């Protein structure tokens, strides 16, 4: 099969795979992604940093063969596993069948992970590594740095001292499938928005660890030496500081003035309420997004919550409880824990036909999710003009509060 | 406009609307529904029991005009509203305008709900009814029976006793849109399964109030006459004891031997677990259903739950929580309160890669939802052969418990 490797420095090649067709990656929507694997070529040997999703071996392999072609090398000598997740380890056993001599390099925890996933790796040689440990390839040294919970217990970064490339696994990744491999080669909106989404859905609960890990990279004195950041998804950062600055901002809760309005509805009244709240917030010169849970994915919603100082979540009440779709978002938000960056303000609202109770349940679940809920707007059936005025007011107050 | 009315008894005609297009009625999936209005004509006056969704007046009005020409009467003399909900009250403004003399007949609570929906009816003549009240039509008499929380606070039945016909509104309804009007005129599998899904999604939490309502009609000496049930959705029950006996089974929790397996997954490990649980259930000769939350609607899932003695719920853990899709089903289950029919047995399972926590949360939330849930199957990453043997055993044991 014909697929070319892409040279990113002297002796360092991208040799991953392009997944044009992926549209839904475990409850995360996208327009394709890539699985980035990299081949590092020293004097004495070559290392393969990560691999790809199962079934994609032929493509990965064509690319490494092409890169072994150009450097005049014979084989992969070392297989590095930054991370155990399926999309980066999925062809590890094909790799081990193709290069029988090559040890697998990973953290002590990852070896349990890897043996659980693919038991046929029972008599593979595993070299355990921890922070500080080095792999010398000849004029090229690989330094390992353990990153537990960023984003899994098993994970680590590999650093290549001479080229200043940080191989970061999921960290700094973005889900985008372009023919261009570098950050500077595509629209920056598209780049930064995919990066933002990745952060909102995957890094948000890790935010404090993100910050501390920045310090520990600084304390070891490794930030000066970082000239390129090569994650396992999406674009390679030829401007590492662009994304580090963005991650720092997201982790410390920066945000411009913005209210995210989220709702569901059966008969429209809560929709009417949602609209008036949006108008109110709009009156204060604040940015305003409106989401409907019947239509909109939670990964797209959460991407805006990240850049929002406040939200308004509304739903009608059915048999004492909120409309169930709201239960999906709130469970997700209880995992993501936005309070770890910023305790965002929240308005809770809805229409109801009797005793109600949707606003009560949403309050509790918003609190446990780390939102500060002040006031609610509860309407009996279709809101009158004056009731829609009160939603306008609530919308405006919420916005003024975060100005 | 040409739309003909249907004689269902002497002086009694269906005059509803056929909604072929509806596919989604507030999170309830269907292949069309109907809005049944009934024209009831005595020797002195004519009553119109209920109406239809907003914007569908010309269709309803066409049918009521056919029924009028057919039966030889001039216009509608009384407007009857059993339910305030807009699929049955959506053209009441256009009926009050078309018949500016015809009083609106509803309960006390309905009036507040109907004025809030349509502020225009402020200067309309309301004729407030309660249980035992009669509207004499000249030879035919209507008897009004209140049914609060059955389905709504403002709900009521209208009866015809010298004729034994129950106008039950949402009760005994089914979301079907068929050219045929009667229960007997369409396959009973289709009929009953419709009626099943309608009970499961709409009547379940009302179960105990359905048995007491049967006790009350029997105490007032009215049900041992029953010839026909005429609901506001779907087929007219010419065999009313079939749906009344089914409703009795559903409210007391009768069920055949059946387990329902429900799960979500990201990488397929929880899926391998669900399939093994199902195999185990199957080894006991019990009926089995298997739903994935990524694909399947909550109204379909719940329909099978109604006919199941036991369920299994599985999900991988994601940031210390179960897969978010679970939160939607659990919040919906929490409102349906299946424990008012039968405390069903439950099995909680799922794969994880660290500390877990999903199955602890599901065990907790399912018990809140009225299920009796002992035992979780928790697997680290990909389940081994023995771990799937263990899942098989869990499903078998769940299955044997309900035999
Ligand atoms: C399935 C069904 C059950 C309901 N149960 C309740 C309830 O328990 N308590 C309540 O206050 N309203 C209940 N409602 C009434 C609605 O909450 C009310 O009509 C509300 O205004 C709907 O707002 P929406 O237009 O945004 O859908 C129920 C409505 C339906 C459709
Ligand atoms: C987004 C992400 C976050 C995760 N967070 C946790 C965690 O909180 N705790 C844990 O035990 N596992 C966590 N997991 C690991 C999954 O539970 C594990 O990979 C599991 O095998 C998935 O099961 P499945 O194959 O059925 O999707 C996480 C996985 C992903 C991809
Ligand atoms: Fe990952
Ligand atoms: Fe990844
Ligand atoms: Fe209704
Ligand atoms: Fe209805």
Swiss-Prot record, chains A, B:
Q: Which CDD domains match?
A: flavodiiron_proteins_MBL-fold
The conditions that induce or repress this protein are given as: By iron limitation.
Entry keyword set: Electron transport, Flavoprotein, FMN, Iron, Metal-binding, Oxidoreductase, Transport
Q: Quick check: keyword Iron in the entry?
A: yes
Pfam families in the cross-refs: Flavodoxin_1, ODP
For this chain's record, the cofactor binding note is:
Binds 1 FMN per subunit.
- Enzyme Commission number(s) of this protein: 1.5.3.22
Domain Flavodoxin-like positions:
259-399
Catalyzed reaction equations: 2 reduced coenzyme F420-(gamma-L-Glu)(n) + O2 = 2 oxidized coenzyme F420-(gamma-L-Glu)(n) + 2 H2O + 2 H(+)
Kindly give the SUPFAM superfamilies that the UniProt entry links to this protein. Answer: Flavoproteins (SSF52218), Metallo-hydrolase/oxidoreductase (SSF56281)
Which cofactors are reported in the record for this sequence? FMN; Fe cation
Q: Which InterPro entries match?
A: Flavodoxin/NO_synth, Flavodoxin_CS, Flavoprotein-like_sf, Metallo-B-lactamas, ODP_dom, RibonucZ/Hydroxyglut_hydro, Rubredoxin-O_OxRdtase
* Residues noted as binding FMN in the record, renumbered to the chain: 265-270, 317-320, 351-356
Gene Ontology molecular-function annotations: electron transfer activity; FMN binding; metal ion binding; oxidoreductase activity
List positions binding Fe cation 2: 87-88, 170, 233
Q: How does activity depend on pH?
A: Optimum pH is near 7.5.
Q: Which domain of life is it from?
A: Archaea
Give coiled-coil spans as residue ranges: none
Where is Fe cation 1 annotated to bind?
83, 85, 151, 170
Q: What general EC class does the enzyme of this chain belong to? A: oxidoreductase
| Free-text note regarding domains | Contains an N-terminal beta-lactamase-like domain harboring a di-iron center, and a C-terminal flavodoxin-like domain containing FMN. Two monomers assemble via a head-to-tail arrangement, such that the beta-lactamase and the flavodoxin domains face each other, thereby forming two separated and presumably independent active sites.
- Summary of subunit composition and partner proteins: Homodimer. Homotetramer. The tetramer is composed of two functional dimers.
| Sequence similarity | In the N-terminal section; belongs to the zinc metallo-hydrolase group 3 family.
What does the UniProt record say this protein does? Catalyzes the oxidation of F420H(2) with O(2). May be involved in O(2) detoxification, reducing the intracellular O(2) concentration to a level allowing growth at the expense of methane formation.
Q: What is this protein called?
A: Coenzyme F420H(2) oxidase
In its UniProt entry, the species of origin is given as: Methanothermobacter marburgensis (strain ATCC BAA-927 / DSM 2133 / JCM 14651 / NBRC 100331 / OCM 82 / Marburg) (Methanobacterium thermoautotrophicum)
Q: Which gene encodes it?
A: fprA
């Amino acid at each position: 099969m014909k697929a070319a490797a892409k040279r990113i420095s002297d002796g360092v090649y991208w040799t991953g795979v392009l997944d044009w067709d992926l549209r839904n990656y475990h409850g995360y929507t996208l327009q394709g992604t890539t699985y980035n694997a990299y081949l590092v070529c020293g004097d004495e040997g070559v290392a393969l940093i990560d691999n790809s999703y199962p079934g994609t071996f032929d493509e990965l392999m064509a690319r490494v063969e092409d890169a072994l072609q150009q450097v005049g090398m014979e084989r992969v000598d070392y297989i590095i596993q930054n991370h155990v997740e399926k999309d980066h380890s999925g062809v590890l056993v094909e790799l081990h069948r193709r290069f029988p001599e090559a040890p697998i390099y990973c953290t002590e925890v990852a070896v349990k992970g890897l043996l659980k996933h693919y038991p046929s790796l029972r008599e593979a040689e595993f070299m355990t590594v921890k922070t500080g440990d080095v792999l010398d390839l000849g004029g090229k040294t690989l330094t390992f740095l353990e990153t537990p919970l960023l984003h899994w217990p098993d994970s680590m970064f590999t650093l290549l001292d001479e080229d200043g490339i940080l191989f970061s696994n999921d960290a700094f990744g973005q889900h985008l499938c372009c023919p261009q491999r570098l950050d500077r080669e595509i629209p920056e909106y598209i780049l930064m928005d995919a990066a933002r989404k990745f952060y909102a859905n995957l890094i948000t609960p890790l935010s404090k660890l993100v910050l501390k890990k920045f310090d520990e990279v600084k304390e070891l004195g490794l930030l000066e030496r970082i000239q390129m950041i090569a994650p396992s998804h999406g674009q390679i950062w030829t401007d590492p500081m662009k994304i580090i600055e963005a991650y720092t901002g997201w982790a410390t809760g920066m945000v411009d003035e913005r209210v995210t309005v989220i709702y569901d509805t059966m008969h429209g009244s809560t929709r009417k309420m949602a609209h008036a709240i949006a108008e109110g917030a709009m009156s204060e010169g604040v940015d305003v997004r409106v989401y409907c849970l019947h239509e909109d994915d939670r990964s797209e919603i959460v991407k805006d919550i990240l850049e929002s100082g406040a939200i308004a979540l509304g739903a009608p009440t059915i048999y004492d409880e909120p409309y169930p779709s709201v239960g999906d978002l709130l469970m997700y938000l209880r995992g993501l824990k936005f309070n770890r960056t910023l305790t965002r303000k929240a308005l809770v609202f809805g229409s109801m036909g009797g005793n109600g109770g949707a606003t009560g349940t949403m309050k509790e679940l918003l609190a446990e999710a780390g939102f500060d809920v002040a006031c609610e707007e509860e309407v009996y059936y279709v809101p009158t003009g004056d009731e829609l005025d009160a939603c306008f007011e609530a919308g405006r107050k919420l916005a003024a509060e975060i100005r």
